[PDB]
Design a protein around this motif. Sequence first.
Motif, short mmCIF file in Angstrom:
data_model
loop_
_atom_site.label_atom_id
_atom_site.label_comp_id
_atom_site.label_asym_id
_atom_site.label_seq_id
_atom_site.Cartn_x
_atom_site.Cartn_y
_atom_site.Cartn_z
N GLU D 167 28.43 65.54 6.39
CA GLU D 167 27.41 64.31 7.67
C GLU D 167 28.11 64.52 9.19
OE1 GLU D 167 25.52 62.20 6.15
OE2 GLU D 167 25.77 62.93 4.16
N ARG D 178 22.98 62.45 11.06
CA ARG D 178 23.52 62.41 11.14
C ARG D 178 22.74 63.49 9.04
NH1 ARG D 178 25.66 60.49 15.10
NH2 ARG D 178 28.18 61.33 15.06
N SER D 179 22.88 64.64 8.56
CA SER D 179 22.19 65.29 7.27
C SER D 179 23.16 65.57 6.31
CB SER D 179 21.88 66.53 7.39
OG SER D 179 23.16 67.43 8.18
N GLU D 348 25.58 64.17 -1.77
CA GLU D 348 26.16 63.21 -0.87
C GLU D 348 27.56 63.57 -0.34
OE1 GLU D 348 24.50 60.91 0.64
OE2 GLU D 348 25.99 60.05 2.37
N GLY D 349 28.25 62.65 0.85
CA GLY D 349 29.23 63.25 1.41
C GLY D 349 30.26 64.62 0.94
N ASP H 36 26.21 50.40 2.47
CA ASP H 36 25.30 50.93 4.24
C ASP H 36 25.19 52.81 4.18
OD1 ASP H 36 24.33 49.96 6.65
OD2 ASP H 36 25.48 51.68 7.42
N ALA H 37 23.91 52.52 3.52
CA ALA H 37 23.84 54.57 3.71
C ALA H 37 23.71 54.54 4.94
CB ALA H 37 22.93 54.91 2.84
N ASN H 38 23.47 56.12 4.74
CA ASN H 38 23.61 56.81 6.48
C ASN H 38 21.48 56.45 6.84
OD1 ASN H 38 23.46 57.56 8.72
ND2 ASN H 38 23.45 59.96 8.22
N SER H 39 20.70 56.52 6.36
CA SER H 39 18.86 56.38 6.68
C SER H 39 18.44 55.56 7.10
CB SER H 39 18.19 57.05 5.12
OG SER H 39 18.30 55.83 4.26
N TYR H 41 18.94 53.99 9.56
CA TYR H 41 19.57 53.68 11.19
C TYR H 41 18.43 54.84 11.79
CZ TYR H 41 23.77 51.62 11.27
OH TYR H 41 24.51 50.07 10.59
#
Lengths: 197, 98, 98, 361, 98, 310, 138, 41, 49, 37
Positions: D167, D178-179, D348-349, H36-39, H41
């Motif tokens: 991330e 971030r990907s 994820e992560g 709270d996910a990343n996408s 934003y």
Amino acid sequence: IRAALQGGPRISQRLRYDFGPDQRAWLGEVTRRFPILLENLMRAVEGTAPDAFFHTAYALAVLAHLGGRVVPLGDDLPARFADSDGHYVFDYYSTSGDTLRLNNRPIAVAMDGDVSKREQSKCRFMEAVPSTAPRRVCEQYLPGESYAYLCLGFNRRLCGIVVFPGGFAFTINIAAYLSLSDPVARAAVLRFCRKVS
Amino acid sequence: WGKDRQVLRLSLEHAIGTVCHPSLMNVDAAVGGLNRDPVEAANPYGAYVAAPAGPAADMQQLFLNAWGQRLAHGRVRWVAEGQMTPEQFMQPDNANLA
Amino acid sequence: DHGQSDPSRAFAATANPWASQRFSYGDLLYNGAYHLNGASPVLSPCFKFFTSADIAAKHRCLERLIVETGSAVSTATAASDVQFKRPPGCRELVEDPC
Amino acid sequence: PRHHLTRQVILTDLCQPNADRAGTLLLALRHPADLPHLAHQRAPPGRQTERLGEAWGQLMEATALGSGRAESGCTRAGLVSFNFLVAACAASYDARDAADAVRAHVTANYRGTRVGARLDRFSECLRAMVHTHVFPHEVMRFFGGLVSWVTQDELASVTAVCAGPQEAAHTGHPGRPRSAVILPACAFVDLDAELGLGGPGAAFLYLVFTYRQRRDQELCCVYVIKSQLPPRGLEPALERLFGRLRITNTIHGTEDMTPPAPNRNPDFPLAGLAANPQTPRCSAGQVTNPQFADRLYRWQPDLRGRPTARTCTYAAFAELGMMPEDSPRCLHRTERFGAVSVPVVILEGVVWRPGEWRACA
Amino acid sequence: ARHETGGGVNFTLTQPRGNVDLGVGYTAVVATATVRNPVTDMGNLPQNFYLGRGAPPLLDNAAAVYLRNAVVAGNRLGPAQPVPVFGCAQVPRRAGMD
Amino acid sequence: MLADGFETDIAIPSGISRPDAAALQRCEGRVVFLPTIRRQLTLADVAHESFVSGGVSPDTLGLLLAYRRRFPAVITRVLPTRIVACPLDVGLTHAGTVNLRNTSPVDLCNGDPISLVPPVFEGQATDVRLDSLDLTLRFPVPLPSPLAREIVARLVARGIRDLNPPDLNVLYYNGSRLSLLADVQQLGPVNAELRSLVLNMVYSITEGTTIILTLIPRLFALSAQDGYVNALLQMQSVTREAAQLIHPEAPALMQDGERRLPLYEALVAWLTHAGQLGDTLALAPVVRVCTFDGAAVVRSGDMAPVIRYP
Amino acid sequence: IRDLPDLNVLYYNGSRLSLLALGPVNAELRSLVLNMVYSITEGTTIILTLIPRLFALSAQDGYVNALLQMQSVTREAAQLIHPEGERRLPLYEALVAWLTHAGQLGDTLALAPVVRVCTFDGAAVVRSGDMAPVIRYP
Amino acid sequence: GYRYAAAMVPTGSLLSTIEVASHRRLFDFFSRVRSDANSLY
Amino acid sequence: MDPYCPFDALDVWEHRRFIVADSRNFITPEFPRDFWMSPVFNLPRETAA
Amino acid sequence: WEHRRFIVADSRNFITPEFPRDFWMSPVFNLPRETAA
């Protein structure tokens, strides 16, 4: 058959199967029962009508080989691949009781890894384009799968392999023992064949 | 002339490194590709060789009776090229350049 | 097509019968496909000429072709010793009248 | 948090970071000039010698027919993208529908001509890797996941993350920060299902090659396996899945290799001659002299027909990374890759820790 | 961008930029006026196909070794070490650049 | 590894006999096997009771095969509510130092890799029972890497005795004498340790090892001329009375020996199986000791700093 | 080992190496040679002593027959391995001492990966005499 | 994907809260987001 | 008398989605082997003579 | 999952049948080129 089984040969398997530990008592029966089947093949192929005998796949290997000696067959049966190796046309004979043919459409099976080294070879059906109204039980099984079926068949260059229950087989060269002359053979082809347009 | 006003000799004695390599005798692609679309058969006089059959004391008299038709149906290819002007041969008049 | 003439020499059909025909000796040495070279890091200056894949893949409208030879990718590099096939990621903006 | 970036300008012969956008695996190579005589050095006897370089030659000759990317340069290709390697070995997966779906955009969404010529040849090189006995896990090596990529004609700049969380590296587009990890669904195989062990916890990602050794067609399969086992505990689990492949590599693979004339030998009499005190011995000064060595026992071992652990090789592994959450998150979506849809597992992560390779032979 | 490697700390700066043509038709001209040093020497080097490796050899193993020893030694471009199975044979390092 | 480290909370049930609460504060550094990396766990999953097999209580030798399927973690600080521990496979702390209070009859020195061993020693067994919660805690013995390789070698060789219808018990360290126990070994886990040997045994035998067998009569003559070579044979080796009887000679010629290296294929395959075997039987030595203040010996019963390995 | 095919050849990413550069190195390394040959030959006698049919029958068939049954996870383990005045061969006293010595070479000859290189703002290939950037596993 | 800035200023709020993931089958774009996910934003 | 088998017995677990290296099995029915008799083919009534 | 005992088959598997001595010389195998059937 005498040339292939002269003396004491070891009938090694040329095919690929998988065994269970209980299965040896079935294969132990194959030993004691073995030579009577080799009579009954020669008996039952003798016992057919000569009109019915030219509807055998054994005759179809002969009539296709004498065409090379572009000649199709009159009955439109075998596989579209008349390549000189790797394609075989099979009849099944029962191992049990009255030994009779359990086919009327011959079975086209291709294999990979024949005579050139004594190896296993996987089996495969050819095509599924004809589905004329009766389908047989015996066409569903590949050769050597079953307890029930002795198997027999030939190449386009007419080499014979005899598949037993348990994948065991051996090669037979019929072509060194056909005594048919060329005016007899050309007469036999033209009465049973067609020509590709 | 070179770069530094030098007279630089270039000869075909100097041209060994291409032709002397064995890749001129690579034919296989030409035979394997010109047989895609078949062409009509022209006069097979110089394209064929027979085995010597029978005694040679009567060989040629037996020959002309076998080929009395085939000689005169068309024109022999290789002879008619001999009378071509070297500019006329380059032209599409022949249609045998291919 | 040698039933047709050439554009630039409408007098005759070829200038070399051993080039400019399918499966010529001029072909199989220096085509892009038939590949007698390339493992030689040295150049072949007529690779731009005989490669039938490239010219068949080219553009036709002259509002693009003039520009694409003002900044054309070169086939060689200067910093190496001999004419080599280029160290193949680098680019030099070189004009090609050829 | 602390993460480490890498930069290495590598070609786009077998990688398309324009296509395989963000968060894909990458694999480094050994610059194949080392390859050809190692196969001539480390192969088992009786096998074909130079099949590797001749097969690898047909790849490099078919990399670029147009524009003349030459067969040797100062900059040489070192990187192979992961979706290319899946599409290389694509004929051997169990789910044939998703297998060709990976190969679909490889032939289409890449930048080049006749990509399918490369695919059937690079897999043929991989078939030539195993028989000529330079194993690809000796050649392939882990390289980080994409965060940013500066592209042009053939050469391109690659920024990858070697260690730390996937991330936390900045993308370069603040519009899309971030990907996450993108993997095709043909390779992502859990062992939580095939061992039936649920429950929360962390998991250890694993890269796994598969080797089926035979004089016939040889295979390759790549798997990203999510498991709760360590490298100290992975060895029976890879055996239980691929047990039949272990048996065939023992039996086959040793052909052709000449046996000695049977049989050599009747067994050693060390246990038999040690009990009897009448057996002749020799001192330290008496041995390597001929007269004292005449009366001693002669023992000739022969090992030419032995199927040994070098040819009993099946699948191999290395550490890839963790998933430190209480429960890992594995989504199954399809994306474009316009206009081709691919079954994709999104992880994820992921935190990256590479490791040395290990053969399970 | 703050990223610490290499014993110290690297600071990198990026500025994303854009380019749009404002003219319809040609708005710019290159004029080629003069000529500096002609980098490539105008001399002679015959190309060898021994560096090419992609040709099938002739069927006389004495003669193939005979031809290869003949044309390599002592040509300016021929390989010093014999060629590996796929790898590109290298040009010998010349002493001086003329 | 995480940036802030990862810690697991082993929950304590509130039913507490107060002398057992003060007994768990003496646990300050021990080793605890966790089965998963769940951040919250229970004491029931930690103790010996859930650590049993199905119907079978595990023996001492077969206890190692349960260890390598679990995750050894080290307790950092004990609260009255819960116990905080750090896994070793996960990146261990923030700073990189774990304090290990020792339960060892063996003194420790600097830079010694530590594998961890069950309580084996006679009379020096260390368990902590919880009579309120019905919990029995077995805390393994941290040991240096050669002694851990010795005790595994002693116990496995003991089991291969009992498969056939004297003696080898006592090992020495720094001249001191200590013994260990032999009650029973379950015939199943002895077979798994046996098979794990003989697979890696046979895999170390290659075509180049045929040549090295013929160098055996050279060493027995060379050990008389050099005192260093004589100290390797150790007076008890199998090769000595094998050199006095068997005179081998090398097979010749090799198949395709023009191109290849038989001895080199032997050495590489030997290092990957036989030299790897200290990792195969017991678990990996993840832990070594690096004291930040210069001191040679950490005494028995005192804390020691820990930095990861390798 | 040959003192009692050329070994001086190594290629890495298109660069030759010469391990020869003879006098001191062959004598300086001699202790590494002896601990190999002591450990390898002692193993291949004890394994040989427990199973006398290893170099015996067969060359291929009975060996692989004895291999696969030994190779499986099944409970047939000790039934297919073991053989069972007249003096004793100290086998099990030599098993421990051999596992100490062969286990001692484990930590020495593994050559653990202490250092990894992540090239950043520099050349891809780090040559001789260059400063390479260095990152250990986190 | 619906615009996250659009729902920042809503017109009117809902009243009865139910498990919305009871039926996804009657909607168009639906995404369950743990804390709270990343996408976003 | 059994046919010769050098390799005695093995145990392999498989999964249906992970069926790899497709070979086929030898099929024998559920009834015991004593029920299918010796093959008897006779035509003494059909005489060539 | 699916469980089985398993036996690997190779081409080295063979079967050795035994024939009676008077079995091999048979009227069927020794037919002439022309029969009255």
